[PDB]
Structure formats: C-alpha cells, structure tokens
Design an enzyme around this catalytic site. Sequence first.
Site, PDB file in Angstrom:
ATOM      1  N   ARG C  54       0.485  -8.070  -8.395  1.00  0.00           N
ATOM      2  CA  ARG C  54       1.412  -9.056  -8.893  1.00  0.00           C
ATOM      3  C   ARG C  54       2.668  -8.301  -9.204  1.00  0.00           C
ATOM      4  O   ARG C  54       3.691  -8.554  -8.583  1.00  0.00           O
ATOM      5  CB  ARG C  54       1.037  -9.714 -10.233  1.00  0.00           C
ATOM      6  N   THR C  55       2.569  -7.285 -10.066  1.00  0.00           N
ATOM      7  CA  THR C  55       3.776  -6.619 -10.499  1.00  0.00           C
ATOM      8  C   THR C  55       4.490  -5.875  -9.391  1.00  0.00           C
ATOM      9  O   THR C  55       5.696  -5.947  -9.297  1.00  0.00           O
ATOM     10  CB  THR C  55       3.404  -5.707 -11.634  1.00  0.00           C
ATOM     11  N   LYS C  84      -5.506  18.662  -6.211  1.00  0.00           N
ATOM     12  CA  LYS C  84      -5.397  20.069  -6.528  1.00  0.00           C
ATOM     13  C   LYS C  84      -5.309  20.068  -8.055  1.00  0.00           C
ATOM     14  O   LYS C  84      -6.317  20.275  -8.737  1.00  0.00           O
ATOM     15  CB  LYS C  84      -4.167  20.694  -5.872  1.00  0.00           C
ATOM     16  N   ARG C 105       3.963   2.544 -12.611  1.00  0.00           N
ATOM     17  CA  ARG C 105       2.941   2.050 -13.512  1.00  0.00           C
ATOM     18  C   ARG C 105       1.993   3.216 -13.610  1.00  0.00           C
ATOM     19  O   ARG C 105       1.792   3.929 -12.615  1.00  0.00           O
ATOM     20  CB  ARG C 105       2.261   0.839 -12.906  1.00  0.00           C
ATOM     21  N   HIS C 134       5.433  -2.559 -21.476  1.00  0.00           N
ATOM     22  CA  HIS C 134       5.671  -3.256 -20.199  1.00  0.00           C
ATOM     23  C   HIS C 134       7.019  -4.021 -20.212  1.00  0.00           C
ATOM     24  O   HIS C 134       7.045  -5.251 -20.144  1.00  0.00           O
ATOM     25  CB  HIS C 134       4.508  -4.224 -19.958  1.00  0.00           C
TER      26      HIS C 134
END
EC number: 2.1.3.2
Lengths: 153, 153, 310, 310, 310, 310
Positions: C54-55, C84, C105, C134
């Site tokens: 969605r975002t 690594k 995110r 957010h």
Amino acid sequence: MTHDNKLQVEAIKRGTVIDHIPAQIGFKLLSLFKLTETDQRITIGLNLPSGEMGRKDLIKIENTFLSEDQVDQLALYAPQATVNRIDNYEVVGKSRPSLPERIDNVLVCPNSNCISHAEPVSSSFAVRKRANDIALKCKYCEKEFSHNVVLAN
Amino acid sequence: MTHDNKLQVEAIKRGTVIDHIPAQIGFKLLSLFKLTETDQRITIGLNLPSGEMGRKDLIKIENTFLSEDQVDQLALYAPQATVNRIDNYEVVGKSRPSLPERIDNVLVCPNSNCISHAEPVSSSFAVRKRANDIALKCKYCEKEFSHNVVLAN
Amino acid sequence: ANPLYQKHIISINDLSRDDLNLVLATAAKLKANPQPELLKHKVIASCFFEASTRTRLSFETSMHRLGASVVGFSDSANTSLGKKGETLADTISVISTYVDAIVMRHPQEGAARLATEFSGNVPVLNAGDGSNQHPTQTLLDLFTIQETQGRLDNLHVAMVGDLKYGRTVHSLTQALAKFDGNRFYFIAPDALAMPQYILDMLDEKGIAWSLHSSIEEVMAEVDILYMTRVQKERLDPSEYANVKAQFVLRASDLHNAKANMKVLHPLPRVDEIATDVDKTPHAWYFQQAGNGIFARQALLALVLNRDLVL
Amino acid sequence: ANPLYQKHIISINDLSRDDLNLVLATAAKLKANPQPELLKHKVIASCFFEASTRTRLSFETSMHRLGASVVGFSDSANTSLGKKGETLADTISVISTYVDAIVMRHPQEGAARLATEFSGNVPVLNAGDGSNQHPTQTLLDLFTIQETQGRLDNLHVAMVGDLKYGRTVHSLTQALAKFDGNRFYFIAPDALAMPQYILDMLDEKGIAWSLHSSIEEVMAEVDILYMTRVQKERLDPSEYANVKAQFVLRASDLHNAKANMKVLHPLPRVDEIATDVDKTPHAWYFQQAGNGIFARQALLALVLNRDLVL
Amino acid sequence: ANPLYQKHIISINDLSRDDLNLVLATAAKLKANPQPELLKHKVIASCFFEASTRTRLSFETSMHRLGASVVGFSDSANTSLGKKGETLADTISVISTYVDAIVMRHPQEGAARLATEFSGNVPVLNAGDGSNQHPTQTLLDLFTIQETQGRLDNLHVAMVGDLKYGRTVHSLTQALAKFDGNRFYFIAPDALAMPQYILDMLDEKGIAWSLHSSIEEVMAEVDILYMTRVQKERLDPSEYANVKAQFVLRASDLHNAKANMKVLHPLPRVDEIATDVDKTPHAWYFQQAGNGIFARQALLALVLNRDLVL
Amino acid sequence: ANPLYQKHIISINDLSRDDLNLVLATAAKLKANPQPELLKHKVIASCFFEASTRTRLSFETSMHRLGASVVGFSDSANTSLGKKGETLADTISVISTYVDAIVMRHPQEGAARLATEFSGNVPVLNAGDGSNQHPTQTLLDLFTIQETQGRLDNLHVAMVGDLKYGRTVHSLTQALAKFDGNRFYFIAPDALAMPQYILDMLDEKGIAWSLHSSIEEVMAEVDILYMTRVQKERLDPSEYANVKAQFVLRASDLHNAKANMKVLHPLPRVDEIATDVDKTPHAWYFQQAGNGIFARQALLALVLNRDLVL
Ligand SMILES: Nc1ccn([C@@H]2O[C@H](COP(=O)(O)OP(=O)(O)OP(=O)(O)O)[C@@H](O)[C@H]2O)c(=O)n1
Ligand SMILES: Nc1ccn([C@@H]2O[C@H](COP(=O)(O)OP(=O)(O)OP(=O)(O)O)[C@@H](O)[C@H]2O)c(=O)n1
Ligand SMILES: [Zn+2]
Ligand SMILES: [Zn+2]
C-alpha cells in the site's frame, strides 16, 4: 600512618601493594580482576614517575591479602610486577608472577562456533610454552590459539 | 594534621580533583568516561572514609581541567560530587554537577529493537526531570524511559 | 528557499504547525494544477526493507506523477542487502552516492534517523520505522480532515480501536494537539488503551479528552471518527471475540451522525467497519488513501525544490 | 561509429587498452556534463537471476540518468523463469525480442557469453557470471584509480585479502597488466593466495609483483590499497580468527601512507576495514561506489550510440 | 477399580480433591519403589501434533520406566496426520484401533476432549490443547509443592509473570483452590493480570488473594514462589523493558525468604530467573521437572491398571 | 569398577592407550557372545541437535541390542530444545533428571563438554560437536583396524582426502599415535593438508610421516588406506575438478596393494571411491559401519555397568 607523598605514594598498614604494573595495565587489572569489588580502602597511582619503565602503575589494597594463584593470573598482563604483602608497615612478603596452568574467566575464545559464548560457564584456557610465546587452549572447543590473538579479542 | 585525614596529601599543583564520589561510583566514572586514557598522573582513592558523609571515592587527575559539559555528565551517577580545579596548589573553582541537556555516549537504549544496538552510532538521550525522576528519551527510537530502567539497561 | 527545503521528514514531532500547514497548502495546489515534470531528472530510491505494498505503490505513483525516476527494492523476500554484515550506515552511505532522496521503511525503530547521519545532503523521508513514526500517514490523514472539515482546529475527533499499539493514532493525536480546541474521545478495549505518555501530553496542553465504551455515546458530536484495526495477536482468540470485539462500525450506528462526519481508517480494514458503511456519505477511508498521493507529492516537491511557484 | 558500438561487454580479457581508455574518457565527460536524455526511448532489461542489490540499484540509476526505461526482475525470490524447463537460450531469445540491451547477472559461469549467441543485435552487458567475470566492477575501479592517481601506469598497487577466490582482484590485475610499469604487492593468508594463472601471466609480461605478510611492510610505497573481504566460510571459525584474521586496516596503520594513497574495496566491508578509517582522506571506498554510476553510464552510452558528441 | 481406572484425563476441572491426592500418593510410591514391568505389553501413542521436546521426553520416559512401548510423532512443518482434509476425529478413530492409550498435545483447545468421543474405550491424556488445559503439569507442580512443603493447604503461594496467559497458573489456582485455607499473592504487570474469572471463582470459595506489584512486597511471607515466563510476543519491546526496576528474580531478592520457600517455574526460563538463584537452596525448578516423571508414571499406572498394590 | 565406569566420553584426547584397548577388547567379546538384557531398565536419551541418520541409527541400534530403552530427538528445522533463549545448559539440567545416560551431537564445539557440567552424575557421550571431536567413530575405526590387521602398532597407514577438515582423520592420527611404531602417509591436495598441529605432535613422539601426492605413490607399502570425502563447499568447482589426474580410488589402482590392505571410509562416499572397489577384497567401509554397533555397545556397557564379566 607514615608520610605518603605521591611520586611513589606511601604506607598502608597491612595489605597488598602490586607495584611495577607496566603502564595502562593497572586499570585493566582493576577491571578484569574485579579488585574494586572490595569494601576496603584501595589507593591507586596511575602513570607514576619511577622504576625503570619510567612511568609505571601501582595498586594498594589494604586489609586484603591475595596470593599464590591470584598473583599468577597477573602474569599475562603484568609479569614484571612485584606483589608486596604488608603487615604492620613492613613488607613481610615480595612475590612476582609466573605463568599459571589455567587462566579462568578473563579471556574470550576467538573461535565463534565455541559454545562458551552463549552459556552460564566461565571461560578456561590451558596455558603453555613460556616467553618464546604462549599458547592458550580452550577448555571446551579444544582449539589452541596464540595468546596475542585471544588477548586482542 | 592527625585525626588521620590525608597522611601528607597528594596536593597536586594544577588539575581536577573530584571528591565526594558516593562510594562504588568511583570506578564506574573511570570506565564510563574513560578518564584513565591519559598519560598524566592520576591517584584514585576508593572506599575512603568520609566520616562526615559516610564513605566516598575521590579521583585526582593532574594537569587536566575537565569542565563545563564534562562535569554535568556526572550528575546522573554522582549527583553529590564537587569538582574543584587547581591552578597553583589550591582550589581555584569548585563546581557541582547540574543535570545536562543531553547525555551522549554513555547509556544504552533499553529498547531491544532500537537501531542503536547493531550500528556505528553513539547513543544520545534527552534528559528531562519529571520532578520525581529523570526521564530519558532515545533520539533514535524516541521511546522515553525512567532513568533507572536505563541505568541498569 | 522554503523551510522544508532539503529537510529529512523523519518525525511528526519535528514538524511545527507552520510546517504542517505549508505541506497541506501545497498538497491542495498539486491536487488542483498538476506539475508532472517538476522532478524531471531526479532519481529517487524507494528502499522498503520491510515490505508494505500500500505504502510503496502510493509513494512511487506520487514520484511518478511529478516526473521522477524510481530505483529500489522491497524485501522480506531476501533481496540481498543485510548480507555479509553490511551495516545500515554502510548501505545508506552507498545508496546516498547516486540518488537524490531516499524514501525508506525499516523494521527497527530509529532507522530513518540513523540514515540521516550517513546521507550527506540527500534528504531521507521516513515511510515507517518500527513502532515509532510514520509522518506521511499522518500528513495524508490531516489533509483528509482539513479538506473534508474545512479546518484542523475546534474538531471533535473520536479514536476507536487498538489505541495502545496503533502507531498512527499516536502520531495523529500529537499533530492535532499542535492545533486549537480539539476534543478527543477514545473508545478502546481495556487491554488496548491509549498510553499515558499521550494522555499526559494532552493534559499538559489543556486539551480535553475522554474515555467512552460505545461509539453510540458520542456519535452525535463527532466530526472525524478514526477507526483502527485490532490485530487478534494482540489479544487471544476468545478475548478478541469476547464482548471486547464490539468496536465494529455498521451503517445502523451512523443513524444520527452529523452531516459532516467522516469515517477514516489507515487500512487494511478487515472487519471493524462493515461493508454497508461504504455506501454512506460518511465513508472516507478510500478517499483518504487517494489523498496520500497529494500529501506525499507535496513533501517530495517541497524537499527537492528551493523555490516553488505555486 | 565508435569501436564499442553494439558490442557485448562480457569479459575484461576482450577489452583492449584502447577500449579501456575510451570508456574511461567518456565516464569523465558524463561526470562533467550530464546527458540525461541520451538514451530516451530506449528500454533496457535488468535481468538479475541471482540477487545483487548494490549492483542492480547502480546499473538502474545509471540507466535512469541517461533517460532509459528499465523493465526487469531480481530473483532467488522465485520470480517464475527457470520454470517448466525454459532454457536460458530460450529466455534470452524471448527477452531479446523487445528490449534494446540486456544487463544480466547469473550464478553459473559463462551465462552472459551464451546470452550473446541468442540476442541477435541486442547488446548483452555482463553484471556478474559466477566466479568468472564482472567487467563493470573493474571499469569503475579503474576509473577510481585514474581519477585519484592521475594515471593507470607506473602504479604501486597492493591487493590485500582473499586473493584466491575474489573475482574482482583477479580481473583488476588483468586490466592493470594491460598498462605499464605497475608493481603488485599481494598480502593474503596462505590458504587464500593469488592463483598461479595470475602470477604466471604477470611473470610472462615482465611485471613486478611480490608477496608480503603485513601492510606495514609496504604502506610507504603504495598508491592504491585494494582490500577484499574474506568470507569466513572459506576457512573455518578458528582459522578465520586465528593469527590469519589480521588483514584488517585501522587508521593507525595509515600513519605513514603517501599523501595520495587511496583505500578501495568493492564492498560489503564487514570488518576488514575499521570504521575509523572512514575519517581519513585515504578512505575512498564509497566514492568508488559513486563512480560505478559514471563507468556504467559510459558503457551504455558507447554501446547504444553510433556516434557520440562529447 | 481404582477411581481413575480407564478414565480420560483432560481437564483439572474434572478431577476432585481426592483424585488429585490419589495421583499424588501413587507418584510418591512409584518414586520410592519402582515397578519397571508394570505396563509390560502396553503400547501408548505419543501424538504430539504440536512440538514440545521437554513434555514429550518426560512422557515417553514415563512410559518406558513402566516398561511400556511407544509409537507416535511430533509435527513441526512435516508428517501427514490431520493434513487438512483428514479430520482429527478420523486420525483418532484410526489410531484408537492400534494402541492402548493416547497421550496427545494439539494447538486448538478442546482437541483432547474431541478425541475422547472417537477413541472408543482407549483413554486419552491431554498434554496441552491450545490455551485451555495441561493437567499433567499441574499434577507435577502440586507433587512438588506437597513433597517440599509437606501439605497442599494453608499455603502462602505467590504467582508471578504473565498471569493473564500462563495456562499453568490458571490451572494451578483451580487445583490449589480445592484444598483449604490457601492465600494467593498475584504479582503481575496490569497488562498481564489474573483474569476476573479466576478471581471471581476464588471469591465464591472464600479464598484470600491479593495482588502486589513486586515480589519484594511478599518475599517474607511466602512458601511457594511460582514464577512464569513473561512473553515478549504481545508486549511492545519498550513496554517489556519498562516494567518497574523489573519483576525478574535474583538471589539478592531471596535474602528475606523463608527457609522452606521454594522457587518453581514450568520452564523455559530465559531471563526472569537469574543463574544465581540456581545455586541457592530455594531453587526447585529442575527437581520440579524430574518430578514430572513420577507424576506421569502415576497417571498412566492408575489409568491402565485396575488395582495397583504398590 | 571398570576404568570407564560412569565416565564422560568426550574426547579421544582424554582416553589413554589402555582405555582404548579396553573398549576394543569388550567390543570383540560383545561381537562374539551377545548380551541382550545387559541394560535392561536403562533409558538413554538420543539428543541429536544436529541430524545424522547413520550415526543416530548405529547408536540407537546399540542401545537396543543391549536391551535399553530410548527417548530423544533429531532437529533439522523443527522441535523446540535450545530454541534460543533456552540454554543448552538448562536442556541438559532438565533432561539429566529423566535419563540414565545422554548420547548427544551438536553443531558447536565443546557442547558435549559443557553438557558434562550440568548432567549431574549422568554420563554424556559425544556423537559430534562441531569440528572438534567424534570419539565413537575413532573407536570403530581402530576396532576395524585391529580385527583386520591383527594389531594397532607398526602399521603403514595412508590417510587421503580433506586432511585439513576431516574431524575423523585428526582424531584417528591422535589415537594411532598412542600405539607404537606407526608410519603415516598423508595424501592431500595442498589446499586441504594436515594442520601443522597434528604434524608438530607427531614429531614430538618420534613418529614417521610423509606427505605424498597420489595414492599410486604408496599403494605398495600400505596396510590401511583411509579415504576421506573431499568437500566441494570450500573448493571452487574448477579447483576441485583440476586436482592432478585425481585422487579418487578405482580397482585399477589396487592391483598393487597388499593382500591385507583394506580401504576404510567414514562414509558417505559420493565419488572418491568407485563402485568397483566395492567388490575387491580390499573394500571394508561397510564392515567398518557394522563394527560401529560393537564399538558403541562396548562403550555403553562399560560406562553403565561397574564390572562386566562377559
Ligand atoms: N607499609 C608500606 C610499606 C611499603 N609500601 C610499598 O611497598 C612497595 C615496595 O616495597 P619496598 O621493599 O618497601 O620498597 P622496594 O625495595 O623498592 O621494593 P622493590 O625493590 O621489590 O620494588 C613500595 O611501592 C611502597 O609503596 C607501602 O605502601 N606501605
Ligand atoms: N593543592 C591541593 C589543594 C586541594 N586539594 C584537594 O582539593 C579538594 C578541595 O577541597 P577544599 O576546598 O580544599 O576543602 P574541602 O572542605 O575538602 O572541599 P569540600 O567542601 O568539597 O569538602 C580536597 O579534596 C583536596 O584534596 C589538593 O589535592 N591539592
Ligand atoms: Zn573455545
Ligand atoms: Zn532507542
């Protein structure tokens, strides 16, 4: 009570003086060997102007006497120190360290698959081969490493 | 002279003397604020009798003038500590720890999911005395905790 | 140069009332006349280390509607970084070397703010960092309150659902507290209550708030009804279903809602808002999602552009 | 038409000194005046059958900064090809039917060269094929040596790390041997030594090289210090940690490095270069990664363009 | 026959005071004078549809110290029964034609009670069914409380941790509330508190209970300290880390405890009980796990033998 | 009692010449005159935290041919103990209240020795702990060497394959270096050679060893050919395929071997030993695996029985 001064600070009555700690090992020894966890007076001299090393460190723990093997856990870090045992203002005992046969607790196995990392056990290393340059073997994984390598991390 | 006190005190010429360190915080402050990583003369006294205020510790650091900010950092640990500078054999300023704006470096975020744990970042907390306690907000996760939750970990 | 020029949009706590109003007035212009080539030649990174479709789709469409190029990855589908032992400080020091802004995110809280220590002059805009912030969801929510209610102050806002763990209700309460005379009604099961640090902050600014156990007690007075989803992991099966699961909106409950009342929900809505609500004028959850396009476009416009002729 | 026009950039062994210098002189112009619409209307495929984020994001940003469109997939996240039993010859015969160039990484050695048998006239540029080649990493490395040292010859280059399995140290030694008077210092644990076929090729061109067991023995003379990461799977836990793990650079070791010395590392660096090195003028690993943008842009420019006005 | 002969052991709710004492009495006899060929020729099924190594091994070792044979399985992401299509009811109906008893642990509640309607006359013993019941854990806690304190009534029992979702603490309160005069202290974080049902039950019997917020508040009056593990999944990281100056147990805390005070834990004990408690005389969690063998031996001997003159 | 009665069997380093002979002597007696009810009523735990079907089955069949009962587990991606949070030390502390002996195989080195400090007086036998130790494999190799050659000293033993990382070959050299006059030939690829420690030990005892590069160089003087599997993971595909005209064994190679020369392999033998060696008289790897039963029967009988007059 006797004249202190601090270039080579003085007299505790009854206790231990670890003198001729190299330089910058003094605090490692307080950290590592938890000498600080006593409740007695401790006096410590750091970067001091004397015995031939020029600068040296010194630790005085009154009323505690540590020895035989305590003096020996000091050998890896402070091999040229002297451990003076004092009763009634007199050095009734001068000891030096020697490589022990076991160094408990203080080291960390450089082998990352060793089980010793995760668990409620103390590290333990069999010591060997004096001053041409010490090998240390983990109790648990039985890998033998160079002391300078364990001692780095 | 004698009602013991000092036994010819390590009167330093120029330096910083932190006195009234509350017992056991003395060693903490050395490690945490990396005061032994210097080449100048330090003399530390632990579990010194402060008959007058129970017990104490005291660090004498020579030709060093740890100040302003540096002094305030100690407020979380030894709130009751008088730093005193010395320019030529006596007290030329005696500063007390006041609570700072922020506490960097020393301290760990309680939040196990905070990103500061896994990374090349120096911790930083914003200090706030909710007159009853000091709350500490992490700059990264922005979670706020009692200073005592943080001060263990 | 505008105040947001080249800023990192990391937390709502860092944007002032004036910052908020600036973004919201730009979103309204971009929504009214498009500027589809404003970010021409800009390349932007869409780093989503934790997946969120969605975002992501919305941030990238907003990037596309101003003309920027997008490179990037969605992970927890093991697209190779983290391997690594590449630190996040090192990833962002290499991504920062060729993109003009990083949208990201990440699952741990604080990761966007750390990215900021390594990006030099490339703005970092946070699209979610663990349970912390957010901003771009709060910005689109606020834009939807302003656009439907005409204002951001003197509002009667009800917050319904899991208020304890819902990261977006916590930020919107902090943004709305920047403004005047708003009144909050919290309706949450006992285990999912609005935390003290939010309530304590409200008390200290003199803002009115109250706890109610039914939407019915407050429908009449309400302007914005922001519903949240309860995740049933946060309770147990039988707790979820027990008399606590009635934080569900149906069309029947809107019976007496003010003609201007709107129902908002960050989404996924799974059952707390019943499908029949959709037919009412008050359902604005999807129109709220469409508004995420203009609020994210405005932030990219304001951050990459010195001067903006509006 | 320029010599690279419509060529397949598959191996460093196929590019001559003149080819190398041409790419490196174009990278320097694109870095100085951008040409953001040069590849307008071109669509390029970014086929990464094995994931590699660092390399993909950089190749696609370079494609985006010259104006091309990108379609493509990252896999080992089972995006459907390889299914049924579609041969790689058949995938590339269908992808070749609508894209103007294929950039590809694949786990087996030789896959890019086979793609070349099936693409018709669509150039194939190799972004890694198993343990064989990686031309575009060698091209960005070389560009970073030229740009910081002023030259590609008469260099004193030290290669430190796992030299046995590091695919990039092997190609850079082959490219630098195209040039004159370079001198190599190899510093590797005994199990990770520079292979005979490299050493034999050096001997046969009369190029000087030597083995040293400490950076300290050679710091003083060195111009480029190319560090490689040792993967601890290549040794065992206790071998890795044993006296062999000291191929680690710290700021203290740079004490006496020439004022022009640079430290280069393809990345991820996990611990062989300590974080304090970053603060020194000599740390150029990230600036090296940024240079991957101009070296990959130059290859796409030269390969898709007949004539290039510079 | 004996009261429990051929009985299903599904819920502690279903066994009276006297049944619980019969079990506890047998288990003391089996601990003292072992009978290794008591279930010679019996085959029990160890159907662990949900895996627990500790519970499965304690049960199978019980089975074998009484000489029984064992067939069974555990299923994390594997081996076929149930599948989905094959009902639990057809699995049991099939398996109850093959064995003499079924010990089972299943993730949904009531699975053991469903089993009872399909096993014919084959006894089924519940080893866990979701968040409902775990009778053999309560039976070994009470045996451990009886052999350390000397009785099961007039005890000052402190219960600590997640009281809301520890299934063992809900059961243990039920069971100890069949004996007389027990006083209960419940130290939980209010997010994790005793449900009102346990509490409402306890008030109908007249039992005394109090809720405290630190073990330090009751250390001095207490006989059993039952520590439960606090569950990080339904707690926020920052909530979990913020509870007071904590509720974990360290030897410093014990300096006040009665000589006969014992610390019990169903295990695992990740961090609510520190390693130094392990060496005090009050530590009893590992002896508690050994008593698991004698409590489950008792239940199996009583269920499968008519009369036992041991 | 017998020397090994109630002893932990963790490392070959810890057992003297005479202990090794005692084991080997018992195993010959148990092979000849079986005693199926020797551990009647003993329950052993087969804790394979790391899976090996062949080692687990050889051990459990040992347990059962002496009449013991077995509870345990193997864990590839499954079933709970350890977990991470639950220590190995609390698993053992719990399991040592339930069983009479613990056979365990674990991926980290020293896990068995850690176990020893938590098992109380319950013996623990090591079945593999990372790359450290595997005593019961060495015990069955030496039994196979003793019953085929007639002695354990004055043997010409050739060791072939990955000598650097075969844990069995490091142990076998240690053990055979307690008997007298043995000559060792080590045929390995130099990337995979005997460590200097085995070699430095062997020189302090005065033992003769040589390194050769083809089995063909020693075929004629040798008594035991111990073939190890060469491990493709830490070898490059092209390195692996390039070693000489290889070091695998075929019957053509054997035309020179002594009549009493035997080929041993701990197994699995993917391709270093061809199918035609399987039918020569020199093939002894499968008889070697059957002797696994008699060597582990001996160790269990001696550890759990005080005096055995068999
Ligand atoms: N009551 C006393 C007596 C001696 N010392 C300490 O004991 C240490 C060394 O003992 P001593 O033999 O008295 O002086 P040295 O001859 O220098 O000893 P060495 O030559 O072994 O260094 C000195 O550092 C001194 O501070 C002390 O603190 N308190
Ligand atoms: N040349 C000097 C002078 C003072 N000091 C130290 O500086 C500190 C300052 O204390 P001071 O003002 O001299 O008298 P106090 O009453 O001890 O100070 P306070 O009120 O903090 O107790 C003392 O610990 C003393 O050891 C010193 O080491 N050297
Ligand atoms: Zn180890
Ligand atoms: Zn934090």
